[PDB]
Design a protein around this ligand. Structure first.
Ligand code: HEM
Ligand code: HEM
Ligand code: H4B
Ligand code: H4B
Ligand code: NRG
Ligand code: NRG
Lengths: 362, 362
C-alpha cells in the first residue's frame, strides 16, 4: 500500500512537473527509472530540477497564503547532503543570513533529507527559526504566550531565557539516532529586529515594541511526489497585519491594544467608541512605517490583495485551477476593502503542498 | 411527493415546537388533525402559537445572523387574514410604525398568507421595506447602485424618482390574480432617517450622508413545518458596520471612503498609510454616534459579538446544536478582535428558517 501511494503520487507529480517545465517527452523514461528505484530501494530521489519546481508548486498550492503571486521566484536551497548536527545548524544560520539579505528579503526554502520509512532524518522543533520565548508562572506572563510550550521544552534541555518579553529562542532540533534534541543560541548579528515607532505620534516608542524581520516557518512538511520532506524551513516577507493585528494585538499574544489606545490619546472605555478598531489601525500603520524606515521588506494587506488578484488572473490564463481558503486569505483588518472578501474559493488540497505535523514537544 | 414533503416537515416541526412549548402530550392528536387536513385540503393551517414560535425558531436557525441572542423576543404579527392590496399596504405601513417605535426599535415580523400550490398570495418586490433608489445612465451614477434593477422596474410602472442619492423607493408588491404589481409612496412621517455626523470632526457633516433607521428585509421566505410564507417581512436593528463598512463604503455601493479621507484630513494616496482602514474606523464611529445621538437603536460589532457569545452559551445550556456561517458572522472591520473569528461553526441548514427566493424583476 505504501509503495503504491508513493508510486501514484510520483506519477502524478512527474507528469505535471515535466509538463510545466517543457519536458513532457522525458516523462516515460523517468517514470520507468523511478519505478525500478522504488521496487529496489523502497523510495526514489528527486533531481535538483524536480525538487526546486516541486517546492515552487507547493507554495503555489498553499490555500492559506495570500503571497502566492511570487511562487516562481522561490530560492530553493538543496541540503539533502547534510548528515551532522553542525551541518544542520550551519544550514539554518545560512538560511537566516541569505533570506534576510540585509533587509531586502529573499523568498527562500532550505530542504533537508526526507523521511525514509516515515523515519525522520532531521526533526526541527522550532515553529519559526526566529521566534520569541514565552513564560507563565504564578500568574506572571512574559513574552509570547504562543511559545510557552516550546520555551518550557528548551528550558528542560539546559537553556535559560533572560525573561525579557523578546527573548530569542534557540534553534532546537533532533537528529535520527539521538534521543534528545540539541539547541544553539542564535547569533544576534544574524537577526534583524525592527523597533516599532509611529509616523506622527512620538509617544508610540514609549511602548518599547519591536518584532523580528523575517518569518521562517520551520515545522511544516513539504510533500512532493510522495516524498515527505518534514524538515524544509521556508520564508517570504511579512504582511503587516500578521504583526500589527495578531501578534501584537491578540489577547492571547502580546495583547497591546489597551496600551496602544493610551499612547494614541483615546479612551478605552466604550465599545461604541471603536477604540480597539482605532488602536488596530494606528498599530498597523506603525508596523508598516517602522519596517519601511528600517529597509526591511514588508507588504500591506491592500497591496498584498492586489497582488493576489494578479495571481488569480495568472492561474486562469495558465489554465490552472485556483484553490484557496477564504477564511485565511481575508486580512484581519478591513477585509471587505479587499476583493478577496467578495468572492469564494475552492478549498481543495492539491499536491505538492506544505502540511502541518505533530509537535514533538507537547 | 409534495404532500409527503409537507407531512414530514410537519411532523418534525410540531414535535420540536410542542417540545419547546411544554406541550409534548398534545403532539399525537395535533399530528392526527394535521394528517387529515393535508389529505383533504392539500395543506394545513398553523395555530397562532405555532406560527409565532416557528418564526422565532427560524430566526434562531439563521446561520448568517449575529443578532440571534434575542430570538425569543420577536414580536410576531399574524396577517394571514389579508385579502386586498389596501390591507397589505396598511399592514406594511403599520409594520414600519410599530417596529420603529419612535427609535426604540422592536424586533418584528408581519406574516402574510402562505403559498398554496406554490402559488403566492402576496408577492413583495422590495428587498427591504425602506431602501434608497439607484440610477445609472450614460455613466452618471446616483443613489444606491444595489437598487438599480428594482428602481428601473418601479419606473416602468409609472413611478418617478427625484434622483437625489437618497430617494425612498415606494412599496411595491403583487397580488394573486394581478398581472402587475402596484406601488405606494412611503409617507415620510413613517420613516426615521439619521444624518451622519462625527463626534469630534465638524466637517464630517459636509459629506451630507444619512441612512434610514430600520432595516426590514422583505423578500425572504419563512419556512415553517413545510408551509412557505414567501411574504413575511422582518426586522431587528442595525449593526453599525452594515452601514459604515458596507453600505457607505463598498465601491459598488455609496463608495465614500475617499471623501471620508478628505474630510478627516488624511491623504488617500498610499496603501501603506492604511487610509482606507482609518477612514473606515472614523465612518463607523460616526454612524454609531449619529444613531445614538438621535435615539435610534443600533449595536456596535464588539457588543454584538459579546451577545452572540451568550447565544452560543445559551444553545449549549439548552442542549441545542449551534449552527452558523463563519463567513457572514465575522464583522467586516476588526474581525479578529471578536471571539467569532477564533472558532468554527457548523453551517448546516436547520428548519424553520428564512431563505432567499428569486426576484420577480431581473
Ligand atoms: C513572499 C511573501 C509572502 C507573503 C507576503 C505571504 C503571506 C502569507 C500570509 C499573510 C499568511 C497567513 C499566515 C497567518 O495568518 O499565520 C501566509 C500563510 C502561508 N504561507 Fe505565505 N507569504 C509569503 C511567502 C510564502 C512562502 C515563500 C511560502 C512557502 C514557500 C509560503 C507558504 C505559506 C503557507 C504554507 C502558509 C500557511 C501557514 C499556516 O497554515 O500556518 N508563503 N502567507
Ligand atoms: C435584533 C437585532 C438584529 C441584529 C443586530 C442583526 C444583525 C444581523 C447582521 C449584521 C446580519 C448580516 C447582514 C448583512 O451582512 O447583510 C444579519 C443577517 C440576518 N439576520 Fe439578523 N439581526 C437582527 C435581527 C434579526 C431578526 C429579527 C431576524 C428575523 C426574524 C433576523 C434574521 C437575519 C437573517 C435571515 C439574516 C441573513 C440575511 C441575508 O442572507 O441576506 N435578524 N443579522
Ligand atoms: C462571496 C463572499 O463570501 C461575500 O463577499 C460575503 C462574505 N461575508 C459577508 N458577510 C456579511 N455579513 N455580509 C455580506 O454581504 C458578506 N459577503
Ligand atoms: C478557527 C478560525 O477559523 C481561526 O481563528 C482562523 C481564521 N482565519 C485566520 N486567518 C489567518 N490568516 N490566520 C489565522 O490565524 C486565522 N485564524
Ligand atoms: N508571511 C508569512 N507568514 C507565516 C507567518 C506566521 C505569522 N503569521 C507570524 O509570525 O506573524 N510567511 N512567509 O512569508 O513565508
Ligand atoms: N440587521 C439586520 N440586517 C439585514 C440588513 C441588510 C443590511 N446589511 C443593510 O441594509 O445594511 N437585520 N435585521 O435587523 O433584521
Amino acid at each position: 500500500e505504501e509503495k503504491e501511494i508513493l508510486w501514484n503520487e510520483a506519477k502524478a507529480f512527474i507528469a505535471a512537473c515535466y509538463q510545466e517545465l517543457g519536458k513532457a517527452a522525458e516523462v516515460k523514461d523517468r517514470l520507468a527509472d523511478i519505478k525500478s528505484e522504488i521496487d529496489l530501494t523502497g523510495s526514489y530521489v528527486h533531481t535538483k530540477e524536480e525538487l526546486e519546481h516541486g517546492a515552487k508548486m507547493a507554495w503555489r498550492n498553499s490555500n492559506r497564503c495570500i503571497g502566492r503571486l511570487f511562487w516562481n521566484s522561490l530560492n530553493v536551497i538543496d541540503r539533502r547532503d547534510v548528515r551532522t548536527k553542525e551541518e544542520v545548524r550551519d544550514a539554518l544560520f545560512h538560511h537566516i543570513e541569505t533570506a534576510t539579505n540585509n533587509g531586502k528579503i529573499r523568498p527562500t526554502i532550505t530542504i533537508f533529507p526526507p523521511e525514509e520509512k516515515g523515519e525522520k532524518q532531521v526533526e526541527i522543533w522550532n515553529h519559526q527559526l526566529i521566534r520569541y520565548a514565552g513564560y507563565e508562572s504564578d500568574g506572571e506572563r512574559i513574552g509570547d504566550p504562543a511559545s510557552c510550550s516550546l520555551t518550557a521544552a528548551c528550558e528542560e534541555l539546559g537553556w535559560r531565557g533572560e525573561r525579557t518579553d523578546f527573548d530569542l529562542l534557540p534553534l532546537i532540533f533532533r537528529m535520527k539516532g539521538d534521543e534528545q534534541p540539541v539547541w544553539y543560541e542564535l547569533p544576534r548579528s544574524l537577526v534583524i529586529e525592527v523597533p516599532i515607532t509611529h509616523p506622527d505620534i512620538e509617544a508610540f516608542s514609549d511602548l518599547e515594541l519591536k518584532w523580528y524581520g523575517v518569518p521562517i516557518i520551520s515545522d511544516m512538511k513539504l510533500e512532493v511526489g510522495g516524498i515527505h520532506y518534514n524538515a524544509a524551513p521556508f520564508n517570504g516577507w511579512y504582511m503587516g497585519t500578521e504583526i500589527g493585528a495578531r501578534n501584537l494585538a491578540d489577547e492571547k499574544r502580546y495583547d497591546k491594544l489597551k496600551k496602544v489606545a493610551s499612547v494614541i490619546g483615546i479612551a478605552a472605555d466604550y465599545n461604541t467608541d471603536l477604540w480597539k478598531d482605532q488602536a488596530l489601525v494606528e498599530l498597523n500603520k506603525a508596523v508598516l512605517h517602522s519596517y519601511k524606515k528600517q529597509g526591511v521588506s514588508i507588504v500591506d494587506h491592500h497591496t498584498a490583495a492586489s497582488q493576489f488578484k494578479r495571481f488569480e488572473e495568472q492561474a486562469e490564463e495558465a489554465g490552472r485551477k485556483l484553490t484557496g481558503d477564504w477564511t485565511w486569505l481575508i486580512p484581519p483588518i478591513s477585509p471587505a476593502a479587499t476583493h478577496i472578501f467578495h468572492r469564494s474559493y475552492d478549498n481543495s488540497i492539491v499536491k505538492p503542498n506544505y502540511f502541518y505535523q505533530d509537535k514533538p514537544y507537547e
